[PDB]
């Protein structure tokens, strides 16, 4: 198919995330390949590289195509596919649950794959519905979180999704009515603490879980946050006797500074589910783990097992890629590469503190954020970036960068270049 | 890892589907290979070739490795393993989009690609909803099908499980509470459609959908059911103004007899979810497909978007490898190799009819199915089928198999054997 066969198809026949179809304000772009940090698009007939800014939606931590992953990949291919994980174990889920294991948060000892971060997030609430029910306490079956966050598209998740974000006021009454502490601040406020205790307590009885984004909320809108917030959750779900879970889909895997998220206040929780990054951004997969008490507790209820197992449950190519992924991560000095890719998004990013309509510019690790005092329009937005040679895809109004840990210096100065001349044309309306 | 050392990990660290941790009965058997038709597994300590009699969950039907789909990955390795979906698209799925439109019931017009079965499911309710919001009907949101049926495992697709293989019991005040008719039965019978319609008629008000597995109910009881009964809940929906949903992740391209189930019928859902053998066995990636009047419903409706958007949504390796599968299927006689499938499970599985443990036996294209009196003990049965060079997977009362499209005459002679001998264990208590 030539690009223009492509678009057609596309604009009778394709779905889009969030999207209609036959009322897309802004046509896709045709993607024809992609190599390290840089995707060739198609534009005007012609083919242009320009800088994947966003890692593909936070997943291309180590650029596309990348040998090491590459090779993972055909070598798996060569030997098994995939086997189905009833009744079988393989190699590729093996070495990938001694990794996760041994690297994530202290404590978190099982892992259970599936193929998306909404379906690891669903799990996670299903382990903690059946560990309460395994106690004999089945009341405890509601979810507490903090306004601002995300958690994935399915029902579930879409219910301790922010509520105001997630258009939640036309799901009135098919959506599971879940409890929502106000929005967590940037700074650290211990009255923000006790107020959310305040409210928990009221509903301990009731509550499987507090769910969270630790540290960085992603799509609720790239809010940063106090890691001392995370230890105030752990010492409140602890004396209440309330889970913790923590959703690392985004972030996990050296994305925020840390290696995950919770490291930054050395909090373990007692569930975490992880996506993304996983992969390197090749292929769906997603983990959740949690400790050895809850799957013991879980395994000893009436079910005597967790009731879910997904068809491509731990898929050996999938898992082959991670296993891959998370080594070249921890085979190379990553704190070092994020704290230089952070100090880049700081020194280029600056400029655009003193824009007319920049209300804020803030940075944490491989994220860097301008916060605009009006909606970025993408049919401005789009090319402009495209014309400085930098796939950027604002939403809302935040013009922002996850860029991928493999983008040079210089590359990530042309990336904060461009998301500046986006945010200067904002304020030229 | 070694076979051992895979087995110590496994046992302290890995979930299996429906599994415990610390109280698995029988050890999962290590996988080391797959080809063709079939897999290399450890038995004390050796590896031996044994059929995969199961599809490895359905999903394997052009066989493992392959040539033509392992050619199809690889090269769409070399040129761009994923962008991101949201402001870019693709020939990968461009092409599978057109294709998919082409082979499915008349009138499926637009494609959402996700990453599995049970998300393409909440992606169909999601559809449903939206439709009736965006008709002025938000009254409409509980869901009806019939007993027996298996949707997946997400929250949502849970609520329109059968109620006791899904264990409702043990999730009262949780699940959505959705509309169930009696059991479908295997012959034609006109009451049970016109009890159907009154159930329906009483709750239409409130009813978005009709969901039902097409032809075949497979995880909830691999029972088959006259195509007649899905003629009667088009007509039915129709007249009374909700939605038909036809869950195919089982049943489709080919396995039935017919492309799609829904041809033995010659009937199309409003709505269409496709999973397991999209992909060849090879990725998860499920699609959910729509007609033109519920895409323009939605997008004309007060979100004027569609709410959901996997992270890997259209993921180009995953859309590459079903699109090779897929034109490998169209490519031959499809239809005539799964008449002699057929053919040879009935020849080798009628000698158990007449076992005394047997109350069944009965076979629908490349599904081969041996009900028995009583529970099936896998402990027994596992050992024993391979012994005979074939895995099995029992469950329940059932011995059953879904072999791959490749299987020789002599494969499926060796796999029906093995199944009889399993049911003449059954018998001996
Ligand atoms: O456009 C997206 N997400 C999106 C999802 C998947 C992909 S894949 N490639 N790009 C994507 C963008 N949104 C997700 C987050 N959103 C949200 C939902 C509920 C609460 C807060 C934010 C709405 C918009
Ligand atoms: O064990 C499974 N699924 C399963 C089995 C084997 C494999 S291999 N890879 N994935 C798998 C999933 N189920 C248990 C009972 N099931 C069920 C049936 C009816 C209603 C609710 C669940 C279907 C899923
Ligand atoms: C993206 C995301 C999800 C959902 O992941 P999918 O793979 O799109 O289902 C869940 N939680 C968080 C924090 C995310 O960023
Ligand atoms: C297996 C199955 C699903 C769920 O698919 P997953 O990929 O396991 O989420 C949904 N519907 C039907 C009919 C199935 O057989």
Redesign the pocket.
Known sequence: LTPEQIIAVDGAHLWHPYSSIGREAVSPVVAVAAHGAWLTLIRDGQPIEVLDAMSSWWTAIHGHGHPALDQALTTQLRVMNHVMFGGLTHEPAARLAKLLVDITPAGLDTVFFS?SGS?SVEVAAKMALQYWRGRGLPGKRRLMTWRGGYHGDTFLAMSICDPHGGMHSLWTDVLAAQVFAPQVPRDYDPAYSAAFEAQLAQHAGELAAVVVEPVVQGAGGMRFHDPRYLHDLRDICRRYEVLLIFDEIATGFGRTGALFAADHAGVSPDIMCVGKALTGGYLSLAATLCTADVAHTISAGAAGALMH????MANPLACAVSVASVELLLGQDWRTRITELAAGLTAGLDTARALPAVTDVRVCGAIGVIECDRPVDLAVATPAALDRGVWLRPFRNLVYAMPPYICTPAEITQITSAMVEVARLVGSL
């Open positions: 193929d379906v197992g997904p068809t491509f």
